[PDB]
Each structure stands twice: as C-alpha cells, then as structure tokens.
C-alpha cells in the first residue's frame, strides 16, 4: 500500500499534479522450478 502521509505542498505558479513510477524486480534469492509452456499466446 501507498498512503498520503502529510500533503503535497506546491509553491505559486507550479502544477500541483505529479506522477510516481513503480518498478519491480527479483533478488538473489529468487529461484524457479518446473518448466511449463506459457499461456500469453494462442
């Protein structure tokens, strides 16, 4: 989850709307087992 803590303050002559990009990856502990064909294709 990702919560508004206090506010989003902005000085005059500035747009008060921004964006946040989320990224994600695995780590060194990530291990995979049992091969299987995918299902994104038909």
């Amino acid at each position: 989850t990702l919560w508004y803590q206090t506010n989003y303050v902005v000085p005059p002559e500035t747009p008060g709307e921004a964006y946040i990009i989320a990224m994600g990856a695995a780590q060194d502990n990530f291990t995979l087992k049992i091969c299987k064909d995918t299902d994104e294709v038909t």
Binding site: Q5, Y8, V10, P12
Partner: protein, 213 residues
C-alpha cells in the same frame, strides 16, 4: 542534517526488551499546514498505544520506559515561505480556558484534548501555548526551527525524563511535541495552497514490565 540531542543524554537502559519489531519507523499521517493554521501538539506515549506491536505491548503491560527518535519533515516548494518551531515539552499539561474561580464550575480539558491520540490536536491560543505560558521563551526546551528557505527537516533524540524510573504508559503522557507556525505561510496565486507535515518516530530502547494477560 543536524541532530539536536535533548538535554545532552542518550536514551539508555536501566523487564522485557523487544528490540526487533518496535524499533521501526512509525510514520504518522501528514498535517495540512495552511495560511490561517495555529499549531499542533502530540502527547507521545499515547500516540502509539493503538498502532501495532508497540500498542499491543504497551496496553497489555503495566510498567514502561523508553526514549524516542523524532523526525519532522516539511517539504514545500522553493516559492513558498514561512517558518515552524518544533519543540518537545516534558510534562506538557494542557490548561483550561475560562474565567471561573470555583472548583466544579471552572472549565477543564476533556479526554480528547489532553490525550489527542494518533491524529494530534490543534491549539486555540498559540501565543500562550494553551498553558498560560508565553511561547517567546519556549526556546528553553529542546527545539529546532524549520525555516522553509534553509532546510525541510528536524530531528530530536529525546531521552526518558521522569521522576520514577517506571510509569504507566496509558494514564501518564510523559512529554509532548509542539509544532507552531511562528511566521505564517505565504505564496503567490497558482501554487499549492497547503503544505504537508510528516512525522516519523522511533521508540529507542523500549522496556516493558508486568504484563496482565
């Protein structure tokens, strides 16, 4: 950043010690500071009596002793201007506002005013700190200035200040925090009309005793 060590003493031990799940950054919700705001105060050992493992291990016990590491961020744009005064106050007793000298007719603060909880409370007369004491010399306490043209952060490492080395964490708020906008907020039209204030606290060196199941 510059750390103001409260009264020159590190929070030390003297009872169980969690040391794992309670030494984490509890982050309170942000307060929207505006033009006509007055200030905010927080009674500390009952701010975290409803939040997770520290609230569980502070409600189900009877004796309590810990220090605190405070962090107050206030991130505004480079076109806003103003100043805050963040200060801890040991034994911050809220006074009642009235003009009556009779015992059971004089006003007294309620439970929600003395113990605000995890959402804080606002002042009514910030010039007298709601205690009949002028704030101009409130710099006698540990304090920092959050000036919106030099920095945006403050930090106070506050030790355990009490006359008895163990005390109830439910019926006695040890010390309070007070943020006050000494210089008001000013901004040109078209900017963000409210500035968020974020507070994160870390219960350094917690000790609990006498747990009633």
């Amino acid at each position: 950043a510059n750390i103001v060590l409260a009264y020159g003493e590190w929070p030390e031990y003297c009872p169980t010690r969690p040391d794992v799940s309670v030494n984490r950054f509890y982050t309170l919700d942000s307060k929207m500071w505006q033009e006509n705001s007055t200030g905010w105060y927080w009674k500390f050992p009952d701010v975290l009596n409803k939040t997770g493992v520290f609230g569980q291990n502070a409600q189900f016990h009877y004796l309590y002793r810990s220090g605190f590491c405070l962090h107050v961020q206030c991130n505004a744009s480079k076109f806003h201007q103003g100043a805050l005064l963040v200060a801890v106050i040991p034994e911050f007793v809220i006074a009642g506002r009235g003009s009556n000298t009779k015992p059971n007719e004089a006003p007294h603060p309620g439970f929600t005013t003395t113990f605000p909880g995890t959402t804080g409370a606002t002042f009514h007369d910030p010039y007298v700190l709601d205690s009949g004491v002028p704030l101009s010399q409130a710099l006698i306490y540990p304090h920092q200035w959050i000036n919106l043209r030099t920095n945006n952060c403050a930090t106070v490492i506050v030790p355990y200040i009490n006359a008895v080395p163990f005390d109830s964490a439910i019926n006695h708020s040890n010390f309070g925090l007070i943020v006050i906008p000494v210089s008001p907020l000013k901004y040109s039209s078209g900017a963000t009309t409210a500035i968020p204030i974020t507070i994160t606290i870390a219960p350094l060196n917690s000790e609990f005793g006498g747990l009633r199941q």
